[PDB]
Structure formats: C-alpha cells, structure tokens
Amino acid sequence: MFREMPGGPVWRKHYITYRINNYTPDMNREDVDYAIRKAFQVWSNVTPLKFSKINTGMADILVVFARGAHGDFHAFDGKGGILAHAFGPGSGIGGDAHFDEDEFWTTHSGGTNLFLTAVHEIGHSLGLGHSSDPKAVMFPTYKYVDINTFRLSADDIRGIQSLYG
Ligand SMILES: CC(C)[C@H](NS(=O)(=O)c1ccc2c(c1)sc1ccccc12)C(=O)O
Ligand SMILES: [Zn+2]
C-alpha cells in the first residue's frame, strides 16, 4: 500500500534536484541558496552523482522555510525539540519538505548551523539510515565550524562509502 514511486524530473535515485520556492525575510536569502549549493556539493564530492536546481518547474525535492506553522505537517511545536523534518522523498506532495525556522538562525553560526545541518538533512534524502555513533555529521554539532571550514571525518566517510562510490 505504498509501492507507488513516481518522479517528474530526472529521478532515478542517482540524480536529485532541489528547488527553493521561498526563503525567509530575516537574513541574506543568497546565503540560504549558496550554502545549499555548497552543501549538495559535499555529496557529489564523494559520489559520481549530479544534484542541480532548476530555475523553474518541478524538482525531485522542494525546500521551503517558515515559522510557527505552514499548513503542512501538524505544525511545528515551536522553538526547541525538533530542528528539522523530512517526509518520505519520492511522492508528489511528499518530498516538498520544509525547514523549521521557528528557531533563531544566523549565517554567522552560533545558534543552529544550517550548513552542517544541510549535509545532515540530505542524508535522509538518499534513504541513508542512521548509524551507531561514527562521529558522523549526524551527531549534534559533530564539528561545529564555519561553512568554508566544513570538513568530513574518516568515520563519516566509512558510512557513505557503503555505496562503493
Ligand atoms: C528529523 C529528526 C527526527 C532527526 N533530525 S534532528 O534530530 O532534528 C537533528 C539531527 C542532527 C542535527 C540537528 C538536528 S541540528 C545539527 C547541526 C549540525 C549537525 C547536525 C545537526 C532525523 O535525523 O530524522
Ligand atoms: Zn514542512
């Protein structure tokens, strides 16, 4: 009762497209796109895939930020608890996930880093289950650092390598 698995854009588990039809009026909107472009790269760097964003149309997964609530989902509980969410990516209005802005963000980091989190969120995208504790970017602030200082560990590399490149 869920075998359904369609896809409009280049969907083949190999290439995943991401589109941001919205951001949030509080910080450089470009800093939200740039880091997302540098984030999807972290994966291509260690994978022979190709993730690209279309200027307009339908993308494998739609990203949208908001605060308080946004119709979809049972609405965020507020600041705390969860920091992000991700629904089964593959169904029509399913991949079009949304990020919880109910918290205080800052491109300068400090609070909740969206960059480090970026690579984490994508982890679920590639149906990547969770590990035990291999100091993976999953761990809370495994390596809290700027976006240009972002670096993976040999342990986090032992998880993805499971694909053999
Ligand atoms: C959605 C939720 C159940 C869970 N994610 S989480 O617990 O919200 C979760 C897990 C990892 C990280 C954050 C939030 S915030 C952050 C900053 C830097 C690096 C890592 C992370 C999940 O992995 O599915
Ligand atoms: Zn949402």
Ligand SMILES: [Zn+2]
């Ligand atoms: Zn995770």
